[PDB]
Design a protein around this ligand. Structure first.
Ligand SMILES: O=C1Cc2cc(Nc3nc(Cl)ncc3F)ccc2N1
Ligand SMILES: O=C1Cc2cc(Nc3nc(Cl)ncc3F)ccc2N1
Ligand SMILES: [Cl-]
Ligand SMILES: [Cl-]
Lengths: 4, 124, 124, 4
């Protein structure tokens, strides 16, 4: 999961 | 927004759509390319091809379970492009590049047409 | 094999599937979550959820155009997860995390359940 | 396009  | 994003999600979705295709699950159309038949999901075809997008948004054609392609279309070229739609991988070879490029132009798959043009230019 | 791969293909496919959903094109099921209705593509739901995979591979249920979820399921939680399925982005907030996690457990979306558990653990 |  990432900060888009 | 303040969303988080799962990097591998789109790839995992496509992998599962290809597993459904393999197992003939919920396929809803047969594409006929002369003597050959290919089963697929209308939504995946529309998402990848400008031609299928136009066909399945048409009020009469959206209801067809069989679509016949132009007799000039090569079944191997179509098969390579159908595999690309479901996997992101294109089996481009010296022996098939002309048929693949012609099929991608007909199907309106601009990114495929672009890589074929580049590989052809490199050989000249 | 000797294939080439287009990096953005899977993301572009998912973006187009979400555009078809927006425009209600070729949606083939309504998911009912108490008083709310959500239209979607059965194939995308199966590709993202272990519960929908089990439902639409069942010989009787694969033919249903309406699926009613358990009354304990929160419509906002379902809406957030449906948007995630079609975009890879999860709108996770302090005010919805418990409903999202409960919905993801019911829908069998293991990666979502994993990030919810981690965000909850960080708050404790 | 890349070599996968
Ligand atoms: O080279 C290409 C690939 C391609 C795919 C599509 N697909 C869709 N386009 C839109 Cl805007 N919404 C939903 C879709 F399924 C249309 C045109 C083109 N041209
Ligand atoms: O957390 C999850 C997400 C998820 C999706 C699926 N989907 C499919 N699985 C297979 Cl093997 N082939 C085709 C599919 F559409 C099954 C189980 C699970 N569990
Ligand atoms: Cl393309
Ligand atoms: Cl998930």
């Amino acid at each position: 999961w990432v900060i888009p | 927004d303040s969303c988080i994003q799962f990097t591998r999600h789109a790839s995992d979705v496509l992998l599962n759509l290809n597993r459904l295709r393999s197992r003939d699950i919920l396929t809803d159309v047969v594409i006929v390319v002369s003597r050959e038949q290919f089963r697929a999901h209308k939504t995946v075809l529309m998402a990848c091809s400008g031609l299928f997008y136009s066909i399945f948004t048409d009020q009469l054609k959206c209801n067809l379970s069989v679509i016949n392609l132009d007799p000039e279309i090569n079944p191997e070229g179509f098969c390579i492009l159908l595999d690309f739609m479901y996997t992101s991988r294109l089996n481009l070879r010296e022996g098939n590049i002309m048929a693949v490029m012609a099929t991608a132009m007909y199907l309106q798959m601009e990114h495929v047409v672009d890589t074929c043009r580049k590989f052809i230019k490199a050989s000249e």
